[PDB]
């Protein structure tokens, strides 16, 4: 039995996650292709060189969870679909986390986050597929433990890739 600690697709894009730096990088996007809109956190600064754009979730109360499962659903555009694709664009992004006994609010310190894993797509989407309304969506999942403190944050680093985060899900079994 899965106990959901945080689910992005569940909220109607209302979680208002923290993005760094303020003004650039990750953004909250919306797609209307049906009665039910699809919400996401997208970023695509492919040709500005080296990027360091962070996206941090809210405070997640760990509860009685020993270890947790992190499930991500995302899309990544093939760099070969951009002028001088490589060097400009990358095809991965980094997933971070950091435990916290209390809600830190808007306080964000990048040096307090530990790298979980570099997230890579099983399928990249190419212009021919993208100029059509078809996307190849990747599913990746990680576990992490043992967590000690009362809660934890999640972070998403960008290095200059066209990535669309459509769903995050953290939970624990029973």
């Amino acid at each position: 039995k899965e106990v959901v600690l945080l689910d992005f697709a569940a909220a109607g894009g209302e979680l208002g996650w923290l993005t760094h730096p303020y003004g650039k990088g990750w953004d909250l996007m919306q797609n209307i292709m049906n009665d039910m809109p699809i919400y996401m956190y997208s970023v695509c600064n492919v040709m500005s060189g080296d990027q360091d754009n962070w996206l941090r979730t809210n405070w997640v109360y760990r509860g009685e969870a020993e270890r947790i499962f992190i499930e991500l659903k995302f899309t990544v555009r093939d760099c070969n679909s951009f002028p001088g694709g490589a060097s400009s664009c990358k095809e991965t992004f980094n997933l971070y986390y950091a435990e916290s006994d209390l809600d830190y609010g808007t306080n964000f310190q990048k040096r307090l986050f530990t790298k979980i894993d570099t997230i890579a797509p099983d399928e990249i989407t190419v212009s021919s597929d993208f100029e059509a309304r078809h996307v190849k969506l990747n599913v990746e999942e990680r576990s992490v433990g043992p967590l000690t403190r009362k809660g934890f944050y999640l972070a998403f680093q960008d290095i200059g890739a066209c990535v669309a985060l459509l769903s995050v899900r953290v939970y624990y079994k029973k």
Binding site: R67, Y97, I116, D117, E141, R142, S143, V144, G145
Partner: peptide, 6 residues
């Protein structure tokens, strides 16, 4: 395949 983190 699957990854765990300390």
């Amino acid at each position: 395949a699957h990854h765990h983190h300390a």
